[PDB]
């Protein structure tokens, strides 16, 4: 849309793959603070915040924790302790016209700096003296929304970079988004270490004869020995017996 009143989405209740994020081909710059990319690919959270917008290439250096500039001081400001990562693509083809893909007008006049993630979309007249240009002209007629004038002759510093920022919130987290796969094929009739959806143990697995009710997932005999388990993939019931041991 614009850096003026950026666009947002609150991701929740899914399995965050990431297989494409920062691994798809046309990504230009991606870097996160506080979290490593692979751990990220295995981390899981309560919610996600995506914030896309378009800025001029020469201003990408201002999207950083507490970084200072124009776009990051009066337009859109990310916190100082911001955990999460930003990504920027040189959209030197996707959003540009020789006539000027300047439909969006960024903010160049603000009364006071932004609090982190404060949508500050407004249509006002920055001024110096008493009146705005509705009754005055020349002096004190300033308008914060300036066009971009994106056209292809423009150099890199003025080529529209599309940027998307991800923010992971972690307070009181009955986390609804965790998507790491990691499911290996099952082996039967051999002493094997098994990990069924959190149940960890060791033993030999054998075809079952027990009628599990559809809402049950585990089976236990007397004295809490977990005796059987249903597979989370094929729903087949399996019996567990510890492989042979004894004195010599």
């Amino acid at each position, epitope marked *: 849309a614009s850096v003026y009143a950026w666009n947002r989405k609150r991701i929740s209740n899914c399995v965050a793959d990431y297989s494409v994020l920062y691994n798809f081909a046309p990504f230009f710059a991606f870097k996160c603070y506080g979290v490593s990319p692979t751990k990220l690919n295995d981390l899981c959270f309560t919610n996600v915040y995506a914030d896309s917008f378009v800025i001029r290439g*020469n201003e990408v250096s201002q999207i950083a924790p507490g970084q*200072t*500039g*124009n776009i990051a*001081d*009066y337009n859109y400001k990310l916190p100082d302790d911001f955990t999460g990562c930003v990504i920027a693509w040189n959209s030197n083809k996707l959003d540009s016209k020789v006539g000027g893909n300047y439909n969006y007008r960024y903010r*160049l006049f*603000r*009364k*006071s*700096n932004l609090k982190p993630f404060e949508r500050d979309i407004s249509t006002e007249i*920055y*001024q*110096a*003296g008493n009146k705005p240009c509705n009754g005055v002209a*020349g*002096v004190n007629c*300033y*308008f914060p929304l*300036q066009s971009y*004038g994106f056209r292809p*002759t*423009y*150099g890199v*510093g*003025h080529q529209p970079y599309r940027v998307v920022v991800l923010s992971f919130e972690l307070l009181h987290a009955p986390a609804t988004v965790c998507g790491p796969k990691k499911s290996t094929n099952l082996v039967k009739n051999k002493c094997v270490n098994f990990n069924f959806n959190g149940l960890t143990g060791t033993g030999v697995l054998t075809e079952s004869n027990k009628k599990f009710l559809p809402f049950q997932q585990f089976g236990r005999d007397i004295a809490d020995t977990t005796d059987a388990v249903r597979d989370p993939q094929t729903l087949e019931i399996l019996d567990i017996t510890p492989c042979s041991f004894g004195g010599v």
Partner: antibody
């Protein structure tokens, strides 16, 4: 009338400090992008510093770390503290109010000479 | 940091005619500009900013043109008081930035 009057120009021994002041009129400073520029005798001009409306200031590279811009909002004025004045900094310094893409610098300051003992 | 180069260095033209000054950039400057007339003895005065927009008051006798990396200023009919130095200032990096020219000395006869 709308104007910018300057003060602090003078002479100081090398390595010394000084403080330049800039007063405005018929126009506010708190809400105006302020910018101090300087000119060596006989040469062109060079952007020295700027202070924004949020406090984030900036300086040229030649003077980074030594000069500091600040502004007395109560009486609509700007200030620039300088220190460790060396042989180069002998120049006339101008105060300006810059709008940018919507009108380039127009309103300028009377200037202030800054020379050294030798 | 685009370095601007003015041309020619000096110019002496008979009264009543036109005058043409070129200012050349090294990167793109297409509409980031201004032209200042510093009459000898005081601070400069803005005449034409951006590409060719005439600053308020500034006599129509001035005309700016050019785009990209090259621009030119032209004066219709020089009067005796037009003698001053002129500079083309770019601001392609606005927060915080400017880059001045070498200036031009204009006289009469």
């Amino acid at each position: 009338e709308v104007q910018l009057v300057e003060s602090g120009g003078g002479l100081v021994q090398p390595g010394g400090s000084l403080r330049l002041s800039c007063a405005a009129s018929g126009i506010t400073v708190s809400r105006n992008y302020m910018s101090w520029v300087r000119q060596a005798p006989g040469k062109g001009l060079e952007w020295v510093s700027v202070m924004f409306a949020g406090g984030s200031t900036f300086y040229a590279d030649s003077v980074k770390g030594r000069f500091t811009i600040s502004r007395d909002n109560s009486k609509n004025t700007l200030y620039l503290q300088m220190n460790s004045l060396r042989a180069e900094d002998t120049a006339v310094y101008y105060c300006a109010r810059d709008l940018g893409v919507v009108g380039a610098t127009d309103y300028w300051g009377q200037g202030t000479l800054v020379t050294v003992s030798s | 940091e685009r370095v601007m180069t003015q041309s020619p260095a000096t110019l002496s033209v008979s009264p009543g005619e036109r005058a043409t000054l070129s200012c050349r950039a090294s990167e793109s400057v297409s509409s980031d500009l201004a032209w200042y007339q510093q009459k000898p003895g005081q601070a400069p005065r803005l005449l034409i900013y951006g590409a060719s927009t005439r600053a308020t008051g500034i006599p129509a006798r001035f005309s700016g043109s050019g785009s990209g990396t090259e621009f030119t200023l032209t004066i219709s009919s020089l009067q005796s008081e037009d003698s001053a130095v002129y500079y083309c200032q770019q601001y392609n990096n606005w927060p915080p930035g400017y880059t001045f020219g070498q200036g031009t000395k204009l006289e009469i006869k």
